[PDB]
C-alpha cells in the first residue's frame, strides 16, 4: 500500500504516524532493517 | 496454485519461475504412509529456529 516520516524516520516529530517503527533485536535474530 | 497428477487439470502448476538454482537451507525428502486419513503437523518457531 501506498503512503510521513518527516524529516527523517530517526528524528520524526511524529513517531506514531510513520509506519518505520524503532525495535530492538532479539535473541538469535538479526537486525530488521 | 497447483496441480493433480493423478487425473490431470486444464490449468499447469506454476508457482515459481527461477530457472537457476536459488540459495536453499534445507532440502530433504521425507516418505508418509500412504494408507492413512488424517495427518497431524506442528510449526512453531523460537530464537529464530
Ligand atoms: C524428492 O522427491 C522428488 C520426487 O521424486 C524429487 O523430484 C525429482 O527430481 C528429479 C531430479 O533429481 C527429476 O528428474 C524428477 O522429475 C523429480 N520428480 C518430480 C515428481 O518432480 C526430488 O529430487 C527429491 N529430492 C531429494 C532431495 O531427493
Ligand atoms: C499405514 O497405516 C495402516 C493403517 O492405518 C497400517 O496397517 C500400516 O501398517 C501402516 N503402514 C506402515 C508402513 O506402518
Given at each position: 500500500?501506498?503512503?510521513?516520516?518527516?524529516?527523517?524516520?530517526?528524528?520524526?516529530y511524529?513517531?506514531?504516524?510513520?509506519?518505520?517503527?524503532?525495535?530492538?533485536?532479539?535473541?538469535?535474530?538479526?537486525?530488521?532493517? | 496454485?497447483?496441480?493433480?497428477?493423478?487425473?490431470?487439470?486444464?490449468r499447469?502448476?506454476?508457482?515459481?519461475?527461477?530457472?537457476?538454482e536459488?540459495?536453499?537451507?534445507?532440502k530433504?525428502?521425507?516418505?508418509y504412509?500412504?494408507?492413512?486419513?488424517?495427518?497431524?503437523?506442528?510449526?512453531?518457531?523460537?530464537?529464530?529456529?
Open positions: 500500500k501506498y503512503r510521513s516520516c518527516l524529516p527523517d524516520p530517526i528524528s520524526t511524529s513517531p506514531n504516524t510513520c509506519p518505520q517503527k524503532k525495535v530492538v533485536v532479539g535473541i538469535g535474530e538479526h537486525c530488521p532493517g | 496454485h497447483t496441480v493433480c497428477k493423478s487425473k490431470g487439470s486444464i499447469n502448476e506454476s508457482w515459481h519461475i527461477d530457472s537457476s536459488p540459495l536453499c537451507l534445507f530433504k525428502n521425507f516418505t504412509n500412504v494408507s492413512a486419513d488424517w495427518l497431524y503437523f506442528h510449526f512453531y518457531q523460537e530464537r529464530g529456529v
